[PDB]
């Protein structure tokens, strides 16, 4: 571990500094180091980890989509043969993305999930596991593509089952899990009806629980509820 010689607290401090400087690859490396210290993560630390890798992989996904679009056009009937370069460079970005996903999935498996007992941590990490198998699924084409999709589904399902038993319907982790599992259904599993049903039911059950919340909790919950409505508007 290249971070093995830095104090855990210094790694967390520098992750926060990297965030302020918009240096998300550094932020991710610092949080990987903090995870590898072996202690459980606080709520703030879990979100620092998630924010860092979501930003890194988000940029990779954006790049991969640009390149995949160029590649698909280069292969159309009538296009001029550009040679292997577009495929090669899309594969390079794809391999780097898969590497980041494998790294995050490795942290979750060694050993964040197994030590996560509280709903707020365990649901958070299982949602992450679903998210990073989803990103792998977005680029998958081989013998194990259906297994990748099912790994995402299984992680999301375990998170959903815990969230429904242990969290109120307005809990923002529960809401964000349902948002993303709904996108999984729509974009990955070819199940738009399941995606719409999940988003609508999640929204309506949250709506009915808002009356229990403080102003600050209400702001947090309605923020995610609006993303659910946004997706429903896109899909209907």
């Amino acid at each position: 571990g290249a971070m093995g010689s830095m104090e855990r607290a210094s790694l967390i401090q520098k992750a926060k500094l990297a965030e302020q400087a918009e240096r998300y690859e550094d932020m991710a490396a610092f949080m990987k180091g903090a995870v590898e210290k072996g202690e459980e993560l606080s709520c703030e630390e879990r979100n620092l980890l998630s924010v860092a890798y979501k930003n890194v992989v988000g940029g990779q996904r954006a790049a991969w989509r640009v390149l995949s679009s160029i590649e698909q056009k280069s292969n159309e009937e009538g296009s001029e043969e550009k040679g292997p370069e577009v495929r090669e460079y899309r594969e390079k970005v794809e391999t780097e993305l898969q590497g980041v996903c494998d790294t995050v999935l490795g942290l979750l498996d060694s050993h964040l999930i197994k030590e996560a007992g509280d709903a707020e941590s365990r649901v958070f990490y299982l949602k992450m596991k679903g998210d990073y198998y989803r990103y792998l699924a977005e680029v998958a084409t081989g013998d194990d593509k259906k297994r990748i999709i099912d790994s995402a589904r299984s992680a999301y399902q375990e998170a959903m089952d815990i969230s429904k038993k242990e969290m109120p319907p307005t809990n923002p982790i529960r809401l964000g899990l349902a948002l993303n599992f709904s996108v999984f259904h729509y974009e990955i599993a070819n199940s738009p009806e399941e995606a719409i049903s999940l988003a609508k039911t999640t929204f309506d059950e949250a709506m009915a629980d808002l009356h229990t919340l403080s102003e600050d909790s209400y702001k947090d919950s309605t923020l995610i509820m609006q993303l659910l409505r946004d997706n429903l508007t896109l899909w209907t």
Binding site: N180, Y186, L227, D230
Partner: peptide, 5 residues
């Protein structure tokens, strides 16, 4: 793309 968090 749809929203995720």
């Amino acid at each position: 793309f749809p929203a995720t968090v």
